[PDB]
């Protein structure tokens, strides 16, 4: 019932487009963040992920990686597709944003965490 | 070159194998977890990710999704490949483990967080 | 301007009451969660925290621990008090919920993560 | 068996001293981080927390807030006191570091996450 393919926007105004989900739960897309910590121009960035198919849930868990094109960083998102009380779909996700550090001693400070809620455009 | 390709084990005893990293930073592999939250007999599970290639860092950031084959869950990992003080490679990662819940009202409890350190086998 | 003292509710329906913040940034209160992971019954539970006072910010960062009275668990929250575009106050927080485990080998699964948004009652 | 009172060091070299745990599980102490991202001199900073006393566990969960004296930030830690195979105590903790941001629109980027392991000094 709750399918990742298509166009989504989040609570921060960011957009993503996810393509077809193949029989193995794999998908690809693009991500346009509306926000950045960096002082660079934001670029559309590719994403790759999977959606869990065990017991063929109508509201499956999923995960994807966003490989940013304007920074040395990587973000991963994980969450679940729900059908809220109206029949409306909603992705409830959490993410980790990993920055690059030069030295292994700075590893401790390299990872940020937050949430995003996506709905269809 | 701190390279993701090859065989890795973590501090919990889990194993992963990552294949070739193509010119777009994409890779695939398999994951055998040594631990679970789940009711089930553990199965080798596929993973898909990307390694960031901006400025071609010798210690790049990366992310990957593990699409578990014995549970309704998904885990995402993100981190960075370092060359420690010996010349040994080490992946420092953090993860988010998303469980499935039946009801959107239980979403709050569905996400666990932790770390793992990988070294070569 | 944005003061922790008083009564707050969150997006999950939980309530908290925070007493006076002394000259060291310390405060105490109580927390009544509207949600829990088990069927044991919920009890009002104490909280203890501090609010950062460096540069006496009108929107300071803060942290508090909730010492649950119906579980072996502990939750910590950290966040910042903002004055949104209207003059309304809002606490943006993240939390870590640590469960007890009885073997150190299960430590990996003991920590959950999420967010909460509080506004005044 | 596993008591928070005393002097502890972590895997990054940071030290903390925790005072008596009163009958309500409350404790106070001081934290000297060995690392910082800020361009300031590190200062000893106060901590306030609680240890969970439900069922009087010999290895309880706990939480504490560190009110930093050289930045506008706050850190919270949560974890559990274990007695390792040898009768060694160990604190396994996770933390959230909340930075101050000027604008609520930057909230998303204000929270970092990690772990620490403490042992007695
Ligand atoms: C995951 C969050 N949710 C969104 O929709 N967008 C957010 C990600 C921010 C964009 C990443 C690049 C960046 O700002 C930076 C130092 C990095 C680093 C820096
Ligand atoms: C992320 C951690 N690191 C590992 O090596 N394995 C851990 C995750 C394995 C969980 C298996 C699926 C599951 O429990 C579901 C609920
Ligand atoms: C921070 C969130 N926002 C809010 O407003 N409230 C939320 C916190 C939930 C309240 C914690 C008590 C709890 O869920 C538990 C209550 C009771 C439990 C009993 C056994 C348990 C075993 C293993 C893990 C457990 C985790 C949690 C248990 C529990 C566990
Ligand atoms: C919890 C960890 N384990 C320990 O033993 N000590 C660690 C805590 C570090 C001390 C916090 C002060 C700090 O470095 C910061 C304090 C304040 C900050 C404000 C803005 C920031 C933006 C980007 C990166 C930042 C990094 C660090 C910032 C900071 C940052
Ligand atoms: C998101 O999509 C909407 C509608 O397609 C568009 O108007 C908006 O500008 C997009 N936002 C970003 C950040 O690209
Ligand atoms: C990981 O590989 C090691 C060494 O090859 C092996 O002994 C171990 O059983 C593997 N772990 C799992 C969980 O299969
Ligand atoms: C919090 O306060 C509101 C309004 O006073 C009340 O209706 C609600 O049930 C309270 N929630 C809990 C969990 O006590
Ligand atoms: C921690 O304590 C040890 C032993 O007393 C000391 O040698 C070390 O410098 C301390 N570290 C910090 C950051 O204060």
Numbering used by the authors:
A (entry chain B), B (entry chain A), C (entry chain C), D (entry chain D): 3 to 123
Sentences from the paper on this structure:
Egg-white avidin, similarly to streptavidin from the bacterium Streptomyces avidinii, is a small, tetrameric protein which belongs to the calycin superfamily. The structural motif of this protein consists of an eight-stranded antiparallel β-barrel surrounded by flexible loops. In the present work, we have determined the first crystal structures of the avidin complexes with two fluorescent pyrene-biotin conjugates: 1-biotinylpyrene (B9P) and 1-desthiobiotinylpyrene (D9P), which were obtained via a Friedel–Crafts acylation of pyrene with biotin or desthiobiotin, respectively.
The crystals belong to the orthorhombic space group P212121, with the unit-cell parameters a = 57.16, b = 81.95, and c = 107.89 for avidin/B9P and a = 58.97, b = 81.52, and c = 107.78 for avidin/D9P. The final models of the avidin/B9P and avidin/D9P complexes were refined to resolutions of 2.0 Å and 2.1 Å, respectively. The binding cavity in each subunit of avidin is occupied by a single ligand molecule with the same orientation, with the ring system of biotin and desthiobiotin moieties hidden deeply inside the β-barrel, while the pyrene moiety is located at the barrel entrance. In both avidin–pyrene conjugate complexes, well-defined electron density allowed for the determination of the position of B9P and D9P in monomer C, but the pyrene moieties of D9P are not equally well visible in the electron density maps in all monomers that form the avidin tetramer. This degradation is more effective for the monomer where the β-barrel opening site is exposed to the solvent channels. For molecules involved in more extensive crystal contacts, less degradation was observed.
